[PDB]
């Protein structure tokens, strides 16, 4: 049982939940690989193992462990896999599993909200046109005219033989990225690859820096099909600053809905390669990483020039000053648009409360310090001084290979 | 089977082959990562194997591996460990071992400087009084009227028969911390323990916020003895802000010389419990950590209120704005006083150069991401997007328990 200390207050706890981890991480006594973005790289009796644990979890949480439906539901999954080699989740199990995978995500700082999650069950999906309608329902429900609500849509599970449902975009809303002889990029450099697949599959491109890409939706065994997103359905926020009048003229925008559409949801040994989930943004994601990363929109120096900052010496802290103002413009613009957003101080303080909750309830919480601490102003937030333990519990969201 | 390490800003990929030579083990397992823990860790034949590895390292660096001189040194050491249970370093080996310990320190962002280290050999020290003279000479040489120079003074090694030389103070320059009426702390709260000790040992305490502490110096098998630092030896910097003129009236100060004095230096199996070392400050250590940490001087809200920021809501980013200007004040003040200081942009850029040098020289570099990434503006610096591998090489600086 690892001892975990908070260096701001002096309080000590012990993480007993870590003792119950399975899927081993990347570290060994010889070396820690905690900072690696992808840990390492990405006969059916082991399906029954992960399923019996999950069903025991489910009846644990609804109190009804021992007797009744508990040691009843243990049998049909046994018989389902005995009969068919896989099994179907009950809808309440699918709901409970989706919430747990979120609760279990070590890199997610928004997990105080894990209990409020709307699960759309898309397991009877059959075509790519159907997926598109499901995705469009999700986006409409999640966006909710700017009053965002966490949501997940679970597409049919991976099957013995036969292909997989798959969204080729990394998120549901992505901006395009186009090159030149320059090798430079117009738009988002994170999305250069998928932008060229969209074109490779027939997308007439666009002119500028904020073109919402079309979706590539992959029904099982068939090639992807391009689906264009309705402009009515993609809520966006033009960026303005509350006091720097010229900021709006930079023409910056970002979208309302953060919806991750390329991770594999794993519940009770079943795999859902298409289960896009969405919540709402923390402002540093947009302001600091998407707009200021050198390999993203890289706008930092352009803003500093407009603020008349001394970009001729690092010790002026011109980068820090312009970055804060970009974050101020993000928070201001989303509030003025009445689009849900949370600043990194509010988010991290909520995550501390979540750590306290998870301590009482489960004896600890898997947390990835490098991802929980915000990318600006880290030590000004309470999670910086909190020691954390990182480990893998199931259900889980896992990374998966791109279908290329 | 060496870890692949990616830089996400640029797309670089390398493999850390040096990690495979890590000759001691840390707190992580495949089950769980403890990378974020502040304290991760906590006879003749194992002394011999450590000695042989270091001798091998020493003769590698002088392009004389395998020579007669190399093997005579190996056989000399084995003979000395057999006759006395220990051995003595040659002066050239001590200089090389001290530089290697800095080079090997995973939490140090200043390691581009590692080969430029002044080593004072104080292994002939006989008393606490001589120890004090050596320390004062170290402070004088390292400070160098504001043009700071990296240095380490090495006091006699641990040996069977006599107690250890120890410096009880955690740094050579520290400000007192006085518990108070309100139950509050006046001065530096990180230093209440050592402050209470000094008073026990006869120090007549002050009542200010920036009172420099005396040294408690322990000769073998002696109680610690109190030594006052001559005020003219301790170079200090009043803090002012280039454009916030009321900032100077806060009365804030910091000292020029960061000199860590409670770490143990390990070279070839030998242990030096007293070997204080010093460099120069990175500005975020002073501005962000020492002045803004809620458990330290905790000035952030006072500065924000003076700047007329809106401290009623976090979404105004008043904390970030106040902290940026505190860092500006530190950099301006130290430059104005002509005292060496490096900002976090310059320092992390030089660390990136260090990583590249080290990959060519040694096949990798041990680095603790959570300590290398600065506590403000993390993703604005290039180390943020660099994956790192943390592991323990010897020679090394290690933590040790407090002598009390
Ligand atoms: C409701 C408010 C939410 C907030 C404020 C939030 C915020 C964040 C942030 C800031 C990250 C780290 C990524 C980064 O900082 O660059 C993250 C990661 C993550 N979140 Fe949340 N999120 C929310 C909802 C959700 C939901 C609903 C789910 C799933 C059901 C989820 C699952 C995840 C996962 C799996 C990761 C890891 C991403 C990766 O490994 O690339 N989050 N979230
Ligand atoms: C010359 C300029 C130097 C700079 C700019 C520098 C910078 C730093 C910084 C910023 C940290 C982490 C402190 C923080 O929390 O912000 C650190 C840690 C450390 N430094 Fe350096 N340093 C320098 C010189 C040295 C020297 C000369 C030595 C030894 C000979 C050394 C050994 C270490 C060690 C062992 C640690 C880790 C301390 C711990 O684990 O608590 N440094 N350094
Ligand atoms: C629901 C939700 C709400 C919210 N506010 N944020 C998120 C996370 C957004 C995100 C942040 C990030 F920094 C990188 C990625 C994608 C790339 C990452 C990194 C690597 F490429 C593999 N991963 C997939 C995605 C989710
Ligand atoms: C030579 C030098 C130059 C420079 N510029 N900076 C430094 C770092 C100074 C420092 C920073 C820090 F963040 C923590 C500690 C000591 C405390 C650490 C943390 C925990 F309290 C126990 N350890 C002993 C010391 C050293
Ligand atoms: C709990 C957490 O790991 C701890 O507060 C660490 C984080 N990273 C740090 N990094 C540096 N350079 N200095 C520190 O004191 C800390 N504190
Ligand atoms: C190299 C480093 O581990 C990598 O850049 C990580 C660091 N922490 C991060 N944290 C978050 N939240 N998002 C990220 O993309 C990253 N990148
Ligand atoms: Cl994003
Ligand atoms: Cl310090
Ligand atoms: Gd002024
Ligand atoms: Zn680890
Ligand atoms: Zn701190």
From TrEMBL, chain B:
E.C. numbers:
1.14.13.39
Q: Which GO terms describe its molecular function?
A: calmodulin binding; FMN binding; metal ion binding; nitric-oxide synthase activity
* Localization per record: Membrane, Caveola
- EC primary class: oxidoreductase
Q: Kindly indicate whether the keyword Flavoprotein belongs to this entry.
A: yes
Specify the superkingdom.
Eukaryota
This protein's assembly is summarised as:
Homodimer. Interacts with NOSIP and NOSTRIN. Interacts with HSP90AB1. Forms a complex with ASL, ASS1 and SLC7A1; the complex regulates cell-autonomous L-arginine synthesis and citrulline recycling while channeling extracellular L-arginine to nitric oxide synthesis pathway.
Q: What is this protein called?
A: Nitric oxide synthase 3
Taxonomic source organism: Homo sapiens (Human)
Lineage, top ranks: Eukaryota, Metazoa, Chordata, Craniata, Vertebrata
Please give the first and last residues shown and the length of the full protein.
Answer: 67 to 480 of 596
């Amino acid at each position: 049982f690892p001892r975990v200390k908070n260096w701001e207050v002096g309080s000590i706890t012990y993480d007993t939940l870590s003792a119950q981890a399975q899927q081993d991480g990347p570290c060994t006594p010889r070396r820690c690989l905690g900072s690696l973005v992808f840990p390492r790289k990405l006969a059916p009796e082991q399906l029954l193992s992960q399923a019996r644990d999950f069903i025991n979890q489910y009846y644990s949480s609804i109190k009804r462990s021992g007797s009744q439906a508990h040691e009843q539901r243990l049998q049909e999954v046994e018989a389902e896999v005995a009969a068919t080699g896989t099994y179907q989740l009950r809808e309440s199990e699918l709901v409970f599993g989706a919430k747990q995978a979120w609760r279990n995500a070590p890199r997610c700082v928004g997990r105080i909200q894990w209990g409020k999650l709307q699960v759309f069950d898309a397991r009877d999906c059959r075509s790519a046109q159907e997926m598109f309608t499901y995705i469009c329902n999700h986006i409409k429900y999640a966006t909710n005219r700017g009053n965002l609500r966490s949501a997940i849509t679970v597409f049919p599970q991976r099957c013995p033989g036969r292909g997989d449902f798959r969204i080729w975009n990394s998120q549901l809303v992505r901006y395009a990225g186009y090159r030149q002889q320059d090798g430079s990029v117009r738009g988002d450099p994170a999305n250069v690859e998928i932008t060229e697949l969209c074109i490779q599959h027939g997308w007439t491109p666009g002119n500028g820096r904020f073109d919402v890409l079309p979706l590539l939706l992959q029904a099982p065994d068939e090639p992807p099909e391009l689906f264009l997103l309705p402009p009515e359905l993609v809520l966006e926020v033009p960026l303005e600053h509350p006091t720097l009048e010229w900021f709006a003229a930079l023409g910056l925008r970002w979208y309302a809905l953060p919806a991750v559409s390329n991770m594999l949801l794993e519940i009770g040994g079943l795999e859902f390669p298409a289960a896009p989930f969405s919540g709402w943004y923390m402002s540093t994601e947009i302001g600091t990483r998407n707009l200021c990363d050198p390999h993203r929109y890289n706008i930092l120096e352009d803003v500093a020039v407009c603020m008349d900052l001394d970009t001729r010496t690092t010790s002026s802290l011109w980068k820090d000053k312009a970055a804060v103002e970009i974050n101020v413009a993000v928070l201001h613009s989303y509030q003025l648009a009445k689009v849900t957003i949370v600043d990194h101080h509010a988010a991290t303080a909520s995550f501390m409360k979540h750590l306290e909750n998870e301590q009482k309830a489960r004896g600890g919480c898997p947390a990835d310090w490098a991802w929980i601490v915000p990318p600006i102003s880290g030590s000004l937030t309470p999670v910086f001084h909190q020691e954390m333990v990182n480990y893998f519990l199931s259900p889980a969201f896992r990374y998966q290979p791109d279908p290329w």
